[PDB]
Amino acid sequence: EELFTGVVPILVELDGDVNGHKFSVRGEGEGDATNGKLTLKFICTTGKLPVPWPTLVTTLVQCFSRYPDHMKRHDFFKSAMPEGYVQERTISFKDDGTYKTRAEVKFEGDTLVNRIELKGIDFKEDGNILGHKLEYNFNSXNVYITADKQKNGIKANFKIRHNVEDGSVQLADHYQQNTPIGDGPVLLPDNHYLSTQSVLSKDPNEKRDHMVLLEFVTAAGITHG
């Protein structure tokens, strides 16, 4: 019965901890899955953020992807709602540290809500992350999604290339698992991918450390006939 017909509003709240630097982020926006489009505004609610906003983009809602008319049959993310789903990820940054995230994504009335715990261990103090040496952009990936028979959900891995201010690239190898919150009702997709493209900006008026994030996601990689 998985119904994202509207433009559904979105809350994101993350609580985080990197090398003992506690912090909290809040995101409000809206998303239209019909058009694979979404818009979001993230504020760090503990003053200054201790890492680059781009490292958090993956972590900070794949229910919003456009799945073309013939591919609805393979949209786990939606199928799993409103009960929702759990998205766990381990993100290792080559020659630097690591993130564990665990996050619960679900409806709460009108709103789609993504609540996340993130803990980052052992990052170099003059590293590219801890030292905010990363360009404020985010390059696009086509993420491959594959059914997990056993845990009754999906998994994914991919390497994000973050651009560094000196002209080099910071690898962030992502590994991800999703598992529904409820029991009984979900769609397990044959492999396919999610092309996802992102634009980071700033609000002219916003005093707090923040990110504006526009984002466009469509699914493809099944074809038929």
Author numbering: 5 to 64, 68 to 232
What does the article say, verbatim?
We have used superfolder GFP (sfGFP) as a model system to exemplify and understand mechanism of action of these two different nnPTM routes. SfGFP26 is an intrinsically fluorescent protein derived from the original Aequorea victoria GFP. H148 plays an important role in defining the fluorescence properties of GFP through the contribution of the imidazole side chain to the charge transfer network that modulates chromophore protonation state equilibrium, and maintaining local structural integrity.
The simple strained alkyne molecule, dibenzocyclooctyne-amine (1, DBCO-amine) was chosen as it is one of the simplest commercially available DBCO compounds and can add new long range bonding capability (e.g. H-bonds via its primary amine and triazole groups) and is membrane permeable (vide infra). The quantum yield and overall brightness at the optimal 490 nm excitation significantly improved on modification (∼3 and ∼6 fold, respectively). The overall structure of sfGFP148azF+1 is similar to the unmodified protein. Linkage of 1 to azF148 through the triazole results in the phenyl side chain rotating by ∼90° around the χ1 dihedral, with the aromatic group remaining in the same plane. The loop housing 148 also shifts to a position similar to that occupied by original sfGFP, regenerating the solvent channel and interaction network through to the chromophore (vide infra). A putative H-bond between the triazole central N atom and the backbone amide of K166 may play a role in stabilising the conformation of 1 and contribute to the loop shift.
